[PDB]
Amino acid sequence: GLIYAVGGYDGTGYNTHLNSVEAYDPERNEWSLVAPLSTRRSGVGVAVLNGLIYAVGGYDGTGYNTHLNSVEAYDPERNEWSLVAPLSTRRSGVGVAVLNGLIYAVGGYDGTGYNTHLNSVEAYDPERNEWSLVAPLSTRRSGVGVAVLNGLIYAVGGYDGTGYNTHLNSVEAYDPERNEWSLVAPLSTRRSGVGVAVLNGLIYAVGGYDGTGYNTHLNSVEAYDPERNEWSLVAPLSTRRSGVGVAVLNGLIYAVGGYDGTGYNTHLNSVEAYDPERNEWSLVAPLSTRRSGVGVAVL
């Protein structure tokens, strides 16, 4: 029952992309560092499946200077990472979610091979160690938030630096039974690097960067109600954060790290918890290391 913060980018302290990993214990309000990844990765997608944490893709701007297709799995019982089958396509800022026993890697940016933001989508089957491409998004999206609700995968916001050259407020839902994406109600604000989590039947979109309309890193937060196809703005964060990791644990939404390129001009180690019963954010123990583009999962 811990929050894991996987990789990221420290553009303030060490000026480096991170392979380090920390785990948060909410009962004691303590972060602690565990086994690091084999590869430094910012913009890394993180999902939990079969008791393992998967770190999918990312960007290594320190060691290899490349966008990554490699994938690693973390076993908390032995404190070991291990590399598994890589994606068909390199992807940073990739969204990851788990549905029906498969890991979906949604969109991202390939700044190494194809030099393009991606609408493609791949599913990983752990029983066979195989990735396979499925129906692509309607719109290319990097820095895209992804969450699963009511048997559907939602792709929230992102940045299309290839087709429309715009940060996106649009939202798509994937139906695995028919291999179809469909566009639904868009956000009030365009957001790339947006954190997405599901709590109490609602999708929360946390922070992000609006480089198109407001030209600002965001502290605002929106909740999506699928029964009515409506987004609504709720209590904002204490700090603006793009590339923020978001996870749900014990009824609270945790917003982990990120980048404030508007107010403080710094990468963040701070962490906030959202209480939906009171519509309140509150700051808790910060990470040992500042990190934006950080992957967050709960296990």
Ligand SMILES: [Ca+2]
């Ligand atoms: Ca500690």
Ligand SMILES: [Ca+2]
């Ligand atoms: Ca290992």
Ligand SMILES: [Ca+2]
């Ligand atoms: Ca390139």
Ligand SMILES: [Ca+2]
């Ligand atoms: Ca395959």
Ligand SMILES: [Ca+2]
């Ligand atoms: Ca472009």
Ligand SMILES: [Ca+2]
């Ligand atoms: Ca469709």
Ligand SMILES: [Ca+2]
């Ligand atoms: Ca702009």
Ligand SMILES: [Ca+2]
């Ligand atoms: Ca609304």
Ligand SMILES: [Ca+2]
């Ligand atoms: Ca700035």
Ligand SMILES: [Ca+2]
């Ligand atoms: Ca508060």
